[PDB]
Amino acid sequence: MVPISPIETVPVKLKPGMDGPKVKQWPLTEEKIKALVEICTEMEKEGKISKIGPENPYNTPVFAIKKKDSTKWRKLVDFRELNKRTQDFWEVQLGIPHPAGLKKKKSVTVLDVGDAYFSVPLDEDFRKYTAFTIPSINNETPGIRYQYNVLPQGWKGSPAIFQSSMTKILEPFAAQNPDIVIYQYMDDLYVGSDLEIGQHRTKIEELRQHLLRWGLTTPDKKHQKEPPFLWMGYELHPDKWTVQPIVLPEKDSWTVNDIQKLVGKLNWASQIYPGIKVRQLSKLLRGTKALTEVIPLTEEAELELAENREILKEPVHGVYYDPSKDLIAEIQKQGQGQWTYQIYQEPFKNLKTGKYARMRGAHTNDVKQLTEAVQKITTESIVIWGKTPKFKLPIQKETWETWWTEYWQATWIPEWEFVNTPPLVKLWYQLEKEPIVGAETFYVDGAANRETKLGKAGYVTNKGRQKVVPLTNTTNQKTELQAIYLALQDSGLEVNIVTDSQYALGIIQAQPDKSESELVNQIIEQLIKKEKVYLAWVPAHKGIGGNEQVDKLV
Amino acid sequence: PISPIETVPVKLKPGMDGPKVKQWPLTEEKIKALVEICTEMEKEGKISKIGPENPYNTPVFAIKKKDSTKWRKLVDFRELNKRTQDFWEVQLGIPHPAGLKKKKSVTVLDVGDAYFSVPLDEDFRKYTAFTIPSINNETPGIRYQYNVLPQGWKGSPAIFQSSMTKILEPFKKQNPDIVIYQYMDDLYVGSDLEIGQHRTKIEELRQHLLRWGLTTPDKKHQKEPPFLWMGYELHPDKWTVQPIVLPEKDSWTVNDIQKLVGKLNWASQIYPGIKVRQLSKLLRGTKALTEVIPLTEEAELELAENREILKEPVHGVYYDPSKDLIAEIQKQGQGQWTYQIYQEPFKNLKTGKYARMRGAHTNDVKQLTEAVQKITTESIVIWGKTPKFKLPIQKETWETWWTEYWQATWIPEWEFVNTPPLVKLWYQ
Ligand SMILES: Cc1cc(C)c(Nc2ncnc(Nc3ccc(C#N)cc3)n2)c(C)c1
Numbered sequence: 001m002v003p004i005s006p007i008e009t010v011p012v013k014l015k016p017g018m019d020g021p022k023v024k025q026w027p028l029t030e031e032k033i034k035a036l037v038e039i040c041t042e043m044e045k046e047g048k049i050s051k052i053g054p055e056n057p058y059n060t061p062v063f064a065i066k067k068k069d070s071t072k073w074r075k076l077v078d079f080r081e082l083n084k085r086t087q088d089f090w091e092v093q094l095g096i097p098h099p100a101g102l103k104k105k106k107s108v109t110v111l112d113v114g115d116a117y118f119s120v121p122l123d124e125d126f127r128k129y130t131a132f133t134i135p136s137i138n139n140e141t142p143g144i145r146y147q148y149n150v151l152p153q154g155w156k157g158s159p160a161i162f163q164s165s166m167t168k169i170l171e172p173f174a175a176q177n178p179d180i181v182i183y184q185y186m187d188d189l190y191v192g193s194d195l196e197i198g199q200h201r202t203k204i205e206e207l208r209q210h211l212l213r214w215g216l217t218t219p220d221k222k223h224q225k226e227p228p229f230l231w232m233g234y235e236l237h238p239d240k241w242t243v244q245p246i247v248l249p250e251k252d253s254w255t256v257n258d259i260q261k262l263v264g265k266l267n268w269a270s271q272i273y274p275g276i277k278v279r280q281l282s283k284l285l286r287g288t289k290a291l292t293e294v295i296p297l298t299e300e301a302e303l304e305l306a307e308n309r310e311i312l313k314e315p316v317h318g319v320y321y322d323p324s325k326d327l328i329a330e331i332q333k334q335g336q337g338q339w340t341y342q343i344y345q346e347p348f349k350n351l352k353t354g355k356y357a358r359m360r361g362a363h364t365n366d367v368k369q370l371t372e373a374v375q376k377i378t379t380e381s382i383v384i385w386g387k388t389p390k391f392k393l394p395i396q397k398e399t400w401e402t403w404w405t406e407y408w409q410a411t412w413i414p415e416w417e418f419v420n421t422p423p424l425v426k427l428w429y430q431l432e433k434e435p436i437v438g439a440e441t442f443y444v445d446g447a448a449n450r451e452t453k454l455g456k457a458g459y460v461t462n463k464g465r466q467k468v469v470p471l472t473n474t475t476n477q478k479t480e481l482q483a484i485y486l487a488l489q490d491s492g493l494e495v496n497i498v499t500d501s502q503y504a505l506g507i508i509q510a511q512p513d514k515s516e517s518e519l520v521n522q523i524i525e526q527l528i529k530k531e532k533v534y535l536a537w538v539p540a541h542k543g544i545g546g547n548e549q550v551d552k553l554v
Numbered sequence: 555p556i557s558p559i560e561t562v563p564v565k566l567k568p569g570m571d572g573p574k575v576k577q578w579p580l581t582e583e584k585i586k587a588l589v590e591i592c593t594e595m596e597k598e599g600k601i602s603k604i605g606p607e608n609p610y611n612t613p614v615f616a617i618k619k620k621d622s623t624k625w626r627k628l629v630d631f632r633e634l635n636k637r638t639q640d641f642w643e644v645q646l647g648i649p650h651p652a653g654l655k656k657k658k659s660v661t662v663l664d665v666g667d668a669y670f671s672v673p674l675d676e677d678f679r680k681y682t683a684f685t686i687p688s689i690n691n692e693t694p695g696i697r698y699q700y701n702v703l704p705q706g707w708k709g710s711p712a713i714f715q716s717s718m719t720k721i722l723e724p725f726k727k728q729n730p731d732i733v734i735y736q737y738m739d740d741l742y743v744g745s746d747l748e749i750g751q752h753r754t755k756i757e758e759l760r761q762h763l764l765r766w767g768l769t770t771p772d773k774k775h776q777k778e779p780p781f782l783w784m785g786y787e788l789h790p791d792k793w794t795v796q797p798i799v800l801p802e803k804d805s806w807t808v809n810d811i812q813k814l815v816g817k818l819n820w821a822s823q824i825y826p827g828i829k830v831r832q833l834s835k836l837l838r839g840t841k842a843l844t845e846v847i848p849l850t851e852e853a854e855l856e857l858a859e860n861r862e863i864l865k866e867p868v869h870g871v872y873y874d875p876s877k878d879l880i881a882e883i884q885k886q887g888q889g890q891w892t893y894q895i896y897q898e899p900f901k902n903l904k905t906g907k908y909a910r911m912r913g914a915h916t917n918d919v920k921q922l923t924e925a926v927q928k929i930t931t932e933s934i935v936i937w938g939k940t941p942k943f944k945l946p947i948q949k950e951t952w953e954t955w956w957t958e959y960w961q962a963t964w965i966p967e968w969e970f971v972n973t974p975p976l977v978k979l980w981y982q
Contacts, residue, residue: 011607088609092694101690160606167694183692368948375954379579386582386689408974410885410918410947412955435809435843443840462842496843498812502976509974536843537976538812539819542830545808545837 004215007119007169010161012126013087020058020129021081025143028135032064035073036134040146043075048118052131052145062132076154077132083156091160093185099234099241100271100343100351101384104320105181105192107200108238110225111207113166114187115217118150120165130155159186173210177203185231192238233268240317243269248308253294259301260285266308267355272318273311274342274353277304277334282357319349321385329377329389331370333423339373343381343389354380363512363520366425367403370395374413391416395425402427408509428513429527432534439494439532440465442487443546446479446501447553456552457482465490468551479552480504481519484535488526495533500540500547508535561673562713566639572610572681573633577695578953580687584616587625588686591616592698595627600670600778601698608699610683615957619664619784626781629684631706632965638681638709645715647938650875653733655936657744659752660788662931663759665718666739666963667767668778669703669710672717682707705739705778705963721766725759737934739963744790756785790935796905798824798864800857809843811836817980818860824900827863832856871901879903879941881929882971883922884978889915891925892981895933895941904936905981913959922947923959930966943968946975 014020028036043049062077122130130148151158166184174182180203183190191207193200208218228237235242246269249258259281261267270276280301288295325345332340337358342350356373358364374391381389393416404411435441441462448455448471457479458468467486471479480501487497499505507520508527515521527533538544566572580588595601613630640646654660674682682704685695703710711718715736722734732755735742743759745752760782764770768780798821800814815830815837822828832853841847849857874897883893889911895904908925915921926943933941945952949970 010605013607087607089606090609090611090697091606092691095691097690097692101692157606163694164606181692372948372950375950379954382579382581384690386580386585388581404918405887408885408946408978410922410945411951412917412919435807437844441808441840441843460840462840462845498843505976506974534843536809536812537816539816542815542819542834543838544812544815544834546840 005213007121007165007214009121009123010164012123012157012161014085014129015087018085021085022057022059023061023078023081025059025061025133025135026063028063030137032073033134033137035064036062036075037144039073039075040134040144044146046118048148048150049146050127050149052128052147054145056128056131056145056147058129058131060130060132062134077152079130079152079154079156082130086156089157089160092163093159095383096232097183098271098352098384099236100318100321102241102320103323104194105238106194107197108190108192108227108229108236109200109204110223110229111189111191111204112187112219112223113184113189113211113216116166116211116214117153117162117187119214119216120151120162122148122150122152169211169214169216173207239320241320242315242317243272245315246273246312248305248312254297256288256290256293256295259295259297270355271352272350273316274350275311275332275334275340276308276353276355277336277338278355279336279338279357280304316350319345319351321345321351327381327385327387327389328392329381330392330419331373331377331394332421333366333370333394333425335423337364337369339369341373341377343377352384362517363507363510363515365428365511365513367395367399367427370425371411371413374416378414388414392419393417393425394419394421394423399426402430406430427511428524429511429530429533431508431511432532434534435496435536436494436532436534439496439534440491441496441498441546442491443498443548444483444487445499445547445549445552446476446481446483447549448474448476448479455479456554457486458551459483459487459490460546460548460551462546466551477501477503478519481507481517481523483552484508485519485523485526488523488530488533491530493529493531495530496536497534498536498538498546500538500544502537505535505537558671558673561675564638564675564678564709564713566637566678566681570637572683573612573631573637574609575611575613575630575633577611577613577685577687578615580615582689584625585686585689587616588614588627589696591625591627592686592696596698598670600702601700604680604683604697604699608680608683608697610681612682612684614684614686617957617960619781619961620786621784622781624781626963627705628960628963628965629682629704629706630965631704631708632967634681635708638707641709641712643712643715645712648735650938651733651735654735654742654744655790655793656746657733658746658789658791659749660742660744660790660935661752661756661785662788663741663743663756663785664739664782664963665736665741665763666705666778667763667780667782668705668739669714670778671767671776672703672714674700674702674704702778706965708738711736711738721763725762729755735935735938737938737964740934742935786931788931788935790932793904793906793932795867795902796907797867800861800864805846806849807844807846808837808841811847812843814857820977820980821864824868824902825863828860829856868902871903873897873903873937875937875939879933879937879939880944881933881941882944882975883925883929883946884975884981885918885922885946886978886982889921890982891921893925893929894981895929904932906932919947919951919955920959922952923956926966926968927960927962930962930964934964940964940966942966944971945969946971948972 060077060079065074065076067074127147130152133143133145136143151162170182180191180193191204208220211218228235233244235244246265251258266276266278281304284295322345327345329341329343334340339356342353344350356376358369378388397418442459444459446457453473455471455474456468457471460466481504484499484504538547612634615628616625617628619626679699682700685697687695703713733744745755766774767777811833815833818828818830833856836847836853877897879895881893881895883891886892889909891908893906894902896902908928913920930940943966945968
């Protein structure tokens with residue numbers, strides 16, 4: 001006899017103020033009962049369960065399911081009422097590793113702790129809470145009462161305790177072997193190293209030897225799985241990784257599902273193949289929320305699926321991370337609020353790729369968007385590699401400086417270099433800081449009646465030029481922009497414009513290069529053609545010069 | 555005599571479970587730092603590993619204090635603190651030390667030396683749980699819970715307050731002129747003394763606190779890291795709510811007067827009494843923006859009366875220790891940053907300006923974070939409580955970068971101004 005070490009239990013409790021349930025044991029068939037007894041007899045002879053008495057007033061409905069038309073059955077215990085009353089644990093699976101962050105390995109092995117799982121005991125003071133009953137034949141005897149002595153394979157806290165228990169065991173082995181890497185998921189166990197298959201295979205032996213010191217039976221046999229492994233939707237070679245193949249389906253009447261997430265299929269896979277758009281396919285969920293609907297695929301969402309089946313033609317592999325080489329991210333503008341990026345160490349060997357979609361704002365500009373993409377990419381890169389990549393961006397240095405120095409918000413981009421790949425992100429116009437000498441001064445104004453939705457818009461100038469235009473179906477905000485728009489249309493390449501609209505100023509000060517409102521875009525259109533534009537604000541209803549509220553309230 | 559065996563009992567409020575806050579990503583270097591630090595904190599019994607039976611989590615990271623190269627450990631206890639019961643005791647925040655803000659100089663001492671040698675309530679330790687994350691989440695995050703009073707916690711200074719008063723007994727009796735304040739891990743010390751004389755009084759209290767902690771036999775050894783050897787210098791003797799000032803010119807263009815009126819109209823929300831009829835009267839008509847308008851005798855007087863009103867400070871402006879302090883910040887360009895601290899709109903308890911060029915100016919965010927620290931520190935000196943900030947920055951940018959420049963053991967609360975202040979140049 002070679003003595004083994006005990007696996008310390010974990011102090012489990014129920015949610016405060018509550019207690020264990022007493023769910024009805026539903027009637028069974030004689031054969032389902034005869035199956036379970038044989039099953040529950042085996043589990044008891046191994047120590048996975050134990051016989052209890054009437055002192056335990058807790059019950060969980062246990063039943064039987066056939067194992068795909070075979071002679072063997074399957075015991076299922078519905079702990080669904082058990083989980084709603086169990087305390088919360090610290091799950092660590094939240095935020096899975098990303099393959100692009102892993103390093104190359106010469107050898108990678110998968111062990112199996114199928115026996116270690118039931119070698120993991122349960123807190124005894126909690127075992128009472130896990131009780132089930134098999135109805136006897138003909139109900140002419142008291143049903144057998146059982147409790148678990150180990151982590152039940154359907155309980156809420158079974159993964160978290162199995163994981164924690166296993167980690168504490170592996171820790172000294174991983175410590176005295178710094179030249180290997182250990183990882184665990186479900187019933188699996190991954191060991192990688194840069195060892196020759198002789199030294200590597202023998203260390204795998206040592207690990208099974210390590211687990212036998214706690215009484216954990218491990219495979220040893222030539223495992224029925226080899227690289228590449230299929231793990232979390234990934235294909236993991238010890239030197240390469242790529243997703244499990246992405247083939248966009250072929251249908252004529254695309255409904256709600258096969259285009260819109262769901263979870264797949266372009267965003268979960270945009271992490272590796274470059275130049276991918278999804279907005280036109282994403283816009284098919286705007287204002288809709290149907291259970292089933294053959295949604296009209298616009299001719300703007302086909303041109304995206306025409307490139308999607310052009311990029312999905314030639315599959316791309318992802319490389320692993322080399323901590324020595326620099327880390328580099330590159331961004332491109334794709335129009336329509338779309339941005340695409342690749343993170344690589346060596347050119348064209350993308351560790352991973354991605355995309356950023358602009359936020360749901362009313363107005364915006366390219367420079368702001370790029371900034372956001374940079375932060376997202378940055379936060380993502382810290383998650384995966386523990387550092388920020390060096391950036392290459394389609395924006396001139398001089399452009400970046402003009403923007404951040406003159407921008408009311410605080411803003412920042414980490415270390416970066418200009419890459420000359422059109423379209424280049426630019427500033428479309430720049431407002432003067434001082435009134436322009438010699439430029440006509442357009443005092444503008446707009447108003448509308450709340451009831452009739454009727455209003456006016458226009459201007460008067462220092463040269464005598466005047467205009468008022470009447471408007472049907474419009475608002476105060478609408479007439480204030482129209483006023484500025486008119487002054488822009490009718491003025492030379494240089495112009496001073498006085499308004500009282502805090503709203504209009506706040507929009508134009510924001511320096512949008514695009515907008516949801518067409519009236520804002522026409523202004524932007526007008527701004528771009530101008531040499532110098534000075535926009536000045538004055539308070540309303542103070543009889544301030546030029547400002548004639550009288551021409552619009554008529 | 556000595557009996558530190560007992561642990562000071564602490565609880566939460568009913569309905570409020572402990573802090574369950576996600577750990578945000580860290581960089582390799584800050585992960586290494588926290589590895590070595592927490593390795594020693596566990597080997598000094600300050601913390602100890604925990605199992606999955608502990609679901610609670612409070613974020614953690616690493617900073618570097620001013621003029622130091624030693625990675626320090628900060629715990630963003632902002633969620634635990636607000637969930638932590640209003641510490642009803644002998645100290646809920648000290649009797650208002652208003653003499654502190656009047657002193658010629660004030661030196662800030664990090665008394666994170668610390669709250670160790672004081673255990674924590676066993677049933678409460680679970681609520682101070684944190685994770686040291688790994689890059690790419692390749693290894694399970696190292697979990698811990700505090701066994702003693704942790705830095706950053708609001709209950710920590712309010713528990714040591716019975717202990718801290720006794721440590722400051724030979725002092726405070728020797729120099730009854732000196733005001734001493736304590737907020738979080740910081741001990742503020744102020745005096746009306748000359749700078750040379752003032753700098754000496756601090757070294758005295760420094761060597762004095764090398765007695766009850768840090769050095770010397772035990773007696774009284776123990777306690778957390780002696781990282782107190784630094785001390786910033788503050789001069790609240792040089793401060794105010796800055797006056798609103800109008801231009802003084804010999805010739806005014808229509809633009810000048812258009813701006814003046816804009817500014818006065820704004821100020822009138824703060825100072826009832828402001829008039830603009832006579833200044834606006836010059837404007838009436840559609841003159842060119844650069845045309846010089848000579849001031850009429852009626853307008854000149856109205857400008858003069860306006861200066862008068864503005865010279866005199868605002869009236870009816872009182873602090874209220876129950877309401878929240880709000881700090882606004884505006885970016886003025888060229889490293890200039892204006893700020894206001896208020897509780898009611900247009901009722902400023904304090905305005906100021908910041909312009910320090912150090913690690914700048916090519917990084918707005920580094921400038922902004924330092925500005926936030928400075929404003930928070932001043933706010934600690936005046937009212938003994940940090941304000942809620944309104945940062946002129948997109949949430950995403952700030953959340954990505956602020957921890958790279960932060961050097962304070964405390965952390966204020968903040969929100970994000972997304973609409974540009976029209977009133978930006980008016981506060982310069
Ligand atoms: C599924 C899995 C497997 C392992 C061995 C790890 N741990 C780990 N840590 C550092 N670098 C690498 N690198 C690594 C490289 C190739 C393969 C394959 N096939 C697997 C891993 N892995 C991790 C984190 C996940």
